[PDB]
Structure formats: structure tokens, C-alpha cells
């Protein structure tokens, strides 16, 4: 049995069945707890749930076909099954906190995409929206082990460790040495010879992050606010090693809105990028142009992290959830709409051994296993 708790913005019912638009305290989700979830993922005013059974459920704003339910205009107030995938066992849904398209990865390695088609980010050689999931044919001969989506581009990595990117080319986020939009998955040739094991994608003028099995972190794309982590603000269209993180044992990477986050095997959280509204967790709202340890979590072993647009969640090994960043809609879970300038214990979860967290644009999720 997996208990799921949700909070934050709920104007399009992206929290799946609660009353009120600003849920300021984590709230037990009856609908999502009943599904037996292995993953919850949050997009722009949207929530997706992958179950142990391998089904996918979606709720929230339906505009641009972002929920994959065969519609494109209203809201879906209660989690509904994406019945287009009911013949598959889905392992993971990838969606950006500010995104309107998503991908799903099956246990047998197939990738499906749906939602907003702009700039080719769905990977079907076109810019057309897909109101329902569609198999990415270009990946059919490839055994995908992981997926990620930004707001304007997408990525996938093979079991052998090759990285593919597609979607909007502008500002170098795809990593192919130019700024050209790619309407179909394209291998990142620079990283051949590294086994890439994880990738994260940003939004708007976006960065991309990748992690190798040697613990090397690479970044490319838009340079604004230092979110590439090599100082200053210059973008690049070629993957570059973030030297600061070498030897740190990074095991998880994420991209929020204009910022980047890494978690290490020893439990340390690093953040860098745009500082506005305290999304970085360092206590001030200044930008940070090379990775810096989140000092407010020092001595707390973090085992999982999630980023929204302007907020972050981190889970300790004892099941406690810390949040920092913006709180216009209650997504900090501190009972108010006051920003958390430093990581702050979320209320309402004591006795719930949280194992994983998730965020969407302005909303937050915690669940047990």
C-alpha cells in the first residue's frame, strides 16, 4: 500500500480531488493512494502517476493535450487512466515542472510521447501535438533505460549509455554542436565513450545535464544565471564537464526553472543557477554560477530530491521532507504562503515514512513505499 500526499496549487485540480486552490499543508490523496504508485510526476498544472501494475493516470489542466487522455481543452479533476497505454507496462513518466508534453518508458524499453508538439519535442519528425501517447518510432530498435523532458526538448538514454536529444535547438540545449532544431531523436556524439546514466532537461531558455557512471556531470545549453555551473553566463552547444562536481559521487540530477540541482550518494545537495524567490536554498536570492552545497541540509542524509519551477523537496533517510523556495500557492507545505529561504521541515507528515518526492510547476507530492 503506498500513501500519497499532495499540496500546492490546485486551480485546475492538478492535486487530483481536493477542495481549495492553495493547499498549504500536505494532504492525504485518497485517489492516488488507492493506485499503488511507483512514481508520481508533475508538469505544468498536471500530475501523472505510474502504478505497480504499469498503468498511468493523469489529472489537472488538459490544454495542449498535455495529459495524454485524448482531449485538449478542459481539466481532469480526478486521476484518469491513459488507456492508450493499457497494453504496456510503463516504468516511468518524464515531464518537466514547466512542461506541456511528456514521455513514458515501458519495462521492455519502448518510449511513447504526447502533448504539445512544438519544436519537435515529441520526436515524430513533426511539430504536431499528440492528444494521446504515440510510439517514438526512431527509438524502436534501441533499448531505452531512462528518459527526461524539458519544456521544449526531450532526451532518452540507452542501456549501453548513449544519449539522444531532440526538440528545440535554440541556445544549444540539444548538445550537437549547433543550434538546429531536431524533430527526431539524435545521438549526442560528444559523449560517446562515456556511459551516460542520467539526464535532466530545463525549461524556457534551457540547460541540459547528464551524469555518467564515473560520476561525471556534463552541462550544455543556455548559460543565463550560471545554471550550467561553470561561472558567468555563456551558453554552449557542446557538453562540458562541470569540474566542481567531479569526485563528489553525484547520483541524481534535476533541472527546475532556470536552475540545476545534484544529489550525491553520501546525501549532499548542490544547487546553482537563478536565485530569484529563493529556489536555490542558500538563504539569499542571489544567483549562484557554480555548484554550491545546500548548507541548510548539512548532516541530513538526503535520499531523494525533486524540483518544481521555483521550489525543491528533499527526503531524509528517516523519512522527513524538507522544502525551500517560493510559496505563492502553498507548495512549501509550511501552512502559509511565506517563502522558505532555507530548507524547512514540511508539516503534516510525521509518522509517514516518506521515501520519494515529486513536484510540478507550483505543486508538491510525497509518498511512502
Amino acid at each position: 500500500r503506498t500513501k500519497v500526499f499532495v499540496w500546492g496549487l490546485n486551480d485546475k485540480d492538478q492535486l487530483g480531488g481536493l477542495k481549495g486552490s492553495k493547499i498549504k499543508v500536505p494532504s492525504f490523496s485518497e485517489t492516488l493512494s488507492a493506485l499503488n504508485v511507483v512514481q508520481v510526476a508533475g508538469g505544468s498544472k498536471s500530475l501523472f502517476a505510474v502504478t505497480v501494475e504499469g498503468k498511468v493516470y493523469a489529472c489537472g489542466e488538459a490544454t495542449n493535450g498535455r495529459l495524454g487522455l485524448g482531449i485538449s481543452s478542459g481539466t481532469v479533476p480526478i486521476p484518469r487512466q491513459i488507456t492508450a497505454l493499457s497494453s504496456y507496462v510503463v516504468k516511468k513518466v518524464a515531464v518537466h515542472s514547466g512542461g506541456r508534453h511528456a514521455t513514458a518508458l515501458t519495462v521492455d524499453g519502448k518510449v511513447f510521447s504526447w502533448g504539445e508538439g512544438d519544436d519537435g519535442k515529441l520526436g515524430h519528425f513533426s511539430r504536431m501535438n499528440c492528444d494521446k501517447p504515440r510510439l517514438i518510432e526512431a527509438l524502436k530498435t534501441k533499448r531505452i533505460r531512462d528518459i527526461a523532458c524539458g519544456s521544449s526538448h526531450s532526451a532518452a538514454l540507452t542501456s549501453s549509455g548513449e544519449l539522444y536529444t531532440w526538440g528545440l535547438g535554440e541556445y544549444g540545449r540539444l548538445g550537437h554542436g549547433d543550434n538546429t532544431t531536431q524533430l527526431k531523436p539524435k545521438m549526442v556524439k560528444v559523449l560517446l565513450g562515456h556511459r551516460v546514466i542520467q539526464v535532466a532537461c530545463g525549461s524556457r531558455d534551457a540547460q541540459t545535464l547528464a551524469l555518467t557512471d564515473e560520476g561525471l556531470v556534463f552541462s550544455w545549453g543556455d548559460g543565463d544565471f550560471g545554471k550550467l555551473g561553470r561561472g558567468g553566463s555563456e551558453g554552449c552547444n557542446i557538453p562540458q564537464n562541470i569540474e566542481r562536481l567531479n569526485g563528489q559521487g553525484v547520483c541524481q540530477i534535476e533541472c527546475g526553472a532556470q536552475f540545476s540541482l545534484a544529489l550525491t550518494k553520501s546525501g549532499v545537495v548542490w544547487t546553482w543557477g537563478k536565485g530569484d524567490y529563493f529556489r536555490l536554498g542558500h538563504g539569499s536570492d542571489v544567483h549562484v554560477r557554480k555548484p554550491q552545497v545546500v548548507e541548510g541540509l548539512r548532516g541530513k542524509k538526503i535520499v531523494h530530491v525533486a524540483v518544481g519551477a521555483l521550489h525543491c523537496l528533499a527526503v531524509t533517510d528517516s523519512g522527513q521532507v524538507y522544502a525551500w523556495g517560493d510559496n505563492d500557492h502553498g507548495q512549501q507545505g509550511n501552512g502559509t504562503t511565506t517563502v522558505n529561504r532555507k530548507p524547512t521541515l514540511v508539516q503534516g507528515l510525521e509518522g509517514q515514512k516518506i521515501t520519494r518526492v515529486a513536484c510540478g510547476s507550483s505543486h508538491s507530492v510525497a509518498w511512502t513505499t
Partner: peptide, 10 residues
């Protein structure tokens, strides 16, 4: 206004 902030449409 931050471009990545949601508006509460309720």
C-alpha cells in the same frame, strides 16, 4: 513578474 510563476486561475 517571474515568467515561471503560475497564476492561481480560481
Amino acid at each position: 513578474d517571474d515568467d515561471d510563476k503560475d497564476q492561481d486561475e480560481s
